[PDB]
């Protein structure tokens, strides 16, 4: 539901490169140019961002149990 | 080979021979390696024609 901290195959830190990936994707970039701008030159780190889903945004829409 | 090594040597020697094959072969396979791929499924274009 959230981005992982590290690349599984690789160990590269990917937790800081998801909201920047979204911000690059929304303006005018494609996915490949956004991955190239983030420094993820290996496709092992690129597959962590190409197929990532953010299900915690749907989880945060629900009302919390404690006010 | 397995049948005649059972019949000529005995049960225990053949059973040890079974285990003596596989460890050496699997350790040699680390040096050699074996792999199938999508390139093995594609033949010559002349053969395809």
């Amino acid at each position: 539901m959230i981005i992982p901290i590290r690349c599984f195959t690789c160990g590269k830190v990917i937790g800081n490169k998801w909201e920047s990936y979204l911000g690059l994707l929304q303006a005018e970039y494609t996915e490949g140019d956004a991955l190239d701008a983030l420094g993820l030159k290996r496709y092992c780190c690129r597959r962590m961002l190409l197929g990532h889903v953010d299900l915690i945004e749907k989880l945060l829409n629900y009302a919390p149990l404690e006010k | 080979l397995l049948h005649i090594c059972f019949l000529e040597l005995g049960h225990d020697i053949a059973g040890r021979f079974y285990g003596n094959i596989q460890t050496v072969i699997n350790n040699w396979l680390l040096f050699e390696g074996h792999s199938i791929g999508i390139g093995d499924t594609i033949a010559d274009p002349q053969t395809y024609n």
């Binding site: 197929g51 629900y62 | 390696g33 999508i38």
Partner: protein, 436 residues
């Protein structure tokens, strides 16, 4: 149909326009249906038919829900497609978005659900993009120490320690009081040794004053989790009044023996009978280990033979340690070329940065086209890579095929299937061991 996304040109307008008709299976004997308009544009000298009445919108909709999830199902075997449809319902993932408030007896939630990089256009409408089940993982196809034989797989320990297929199993228990006017009375409170008869040997200190545990308390073994004490029947014997040392009996609900975890959610309400009704959800951590059942999207089921750390297994020239290794000998017998096409398209889409299309019966996707596009990205055109030994560092003599695929974990864990018994209960009739 490009402005029904704007306002109003719905599908019923398209049906009412006279271009789409509901043809049933009885009317199929009297109509003529084609694959494509390319069949319509054929010249009459070599035309297969000249009187066409209908045309298929897309043939790939002849599949169902769990059979359309296979990337390139036309390159695979039909019994293996049936196997993938059978174990497609046994995949692990986020089953629903409001699972935090739902109360299911058995549930599983993956940490990081992954949408498939190699996907069709059919899972856009099954909401598998929004609710996925499975993980894209780097796999190679080679033989490493013989532990992957007979459909077996070997995971990477460093990836699993980073969070590869680690999941949470939710288990729900429930209990209820009964205050019927003719019945024994039971109440929810913390049991006491001097007041309850036949108390089982458990740790009763974890319960609260109402006999119901608080969430966040770690439970393990045979810890008591719901405290219910039932009033004993009025067997007031006048021959000996000192024999009634207990007025209540323990009717508590206990944790399952071979499960440990943390109490996630605690629920009290009123049932249809108006009595108190408790429902508790306890979460447990399911780390992948040896023997856990994994499967592909092409019917390549198997179990984890062994785990290997990153320093003790194969690595490429780019230092890429794959997440998972499989047996090549499982490939030709199962007849899964679509798995190889999925791997090649996954490597191409991960190097390029695009979501791959795996729609069946599509002439725009070819093996040679994917090979030609993959050749431009500095890799081998058949997707082969040169790796090294993990223990020694020597180059592998045979080049190996590597790339990302989509693998799905299965619910047949070894923790839910291990059983051992020395001596235990016997039946009241035949004095034989139990069942289950």
């Amino acid at each position: 149909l490009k402005e029904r996304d704007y306002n109003n040109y719905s599908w019923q307008v398209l049906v009412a326009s006279g271009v789409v008709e509901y043809i049933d299976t009885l009317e199929e004997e009297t109509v003529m249906i084609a694959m494509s308009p390319y069949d319509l544009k054929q010249d009459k000298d070599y035309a297969y038919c000249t009187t066409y009445t209908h045309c298929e919108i897309h043939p790939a909709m002849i599949l169902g829900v769990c059979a359309s999830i296979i990337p390139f199902p036309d390159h695979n075997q039909s019994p293996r497609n049936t196997y993938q449809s059978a174990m497609g319902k046994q995949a692990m993932g986020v089953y629903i978005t409001n699972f935090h408030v739902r109360m299911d007896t058995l549930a599983h939630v993956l940490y990081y659900p992954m949408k498939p990089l190699v996907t069709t256009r059919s899972m856009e409408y099954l909401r598998f993009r929004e609710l996925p089940a499975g993980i894209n993982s780097i796999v190679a196809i080679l033989c490493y120490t013989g532990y992957n034989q007979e459909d077996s797989v070997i995971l990477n320990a460093s990836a699993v320690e980073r969070g590869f297929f680690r999941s949470v199993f939710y288990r729900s228990y429930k209990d209820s009081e009964n205050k019927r006017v003719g019945d024994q009375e039971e109440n929810f409170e913390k049991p006491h040794r001097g007041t309850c008869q036949g108390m089982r040997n458990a740790h009763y200190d974890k319960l609260d004053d109402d006999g119901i545990i608080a969430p966040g308390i770690r439970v393990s073994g045979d810890d008591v989790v719901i405290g219910k004490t039932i009033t004993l029947p009025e067997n007031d014997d006048e021959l000996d009044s000192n024999t009634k040392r207990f007025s209540k009996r323990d009717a508590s609900t206990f944790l399952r023996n071979s499960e440990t975890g943390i109490v996630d959610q605690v629920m009290l309400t009123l049932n249809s009978e108006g009595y108190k009704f408790c429902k508790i959800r306890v979460r447990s951590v399911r780390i992948p280990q040896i023997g856990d059942k994994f499967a592909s999207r092409h019917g390549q089921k198997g179990t984890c033979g062994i785990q290997y750390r990153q320093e003790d297994m194969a690595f490429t020239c780019e230092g890429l340690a794959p997440d998972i290794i499989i047996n090549p000998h499982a490939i030709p017998s199962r007849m899964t070329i679509g798995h190889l096409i999925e791997c090649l398209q996954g490597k191409l889409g991960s190097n390029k940065g695009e979501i791959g299309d795996a729609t069946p019966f599509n002439d725009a996707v070819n093996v040679q086209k994917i090979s030609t596009f993959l050749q431009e990205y500095g890799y081998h055109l058949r997707g082969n890579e040169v790796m090294y030994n993990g223990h020694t560092g020597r180059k592998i003599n045979a080049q190996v095929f590597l790339g990302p695929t989509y693998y799905q974990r299965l619910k047949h864990m070894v923790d839910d299937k291990i059983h051992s018994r020395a001596r235990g209960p016997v039946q009241i009739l035949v004095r034989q061991p139990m069942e289950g």
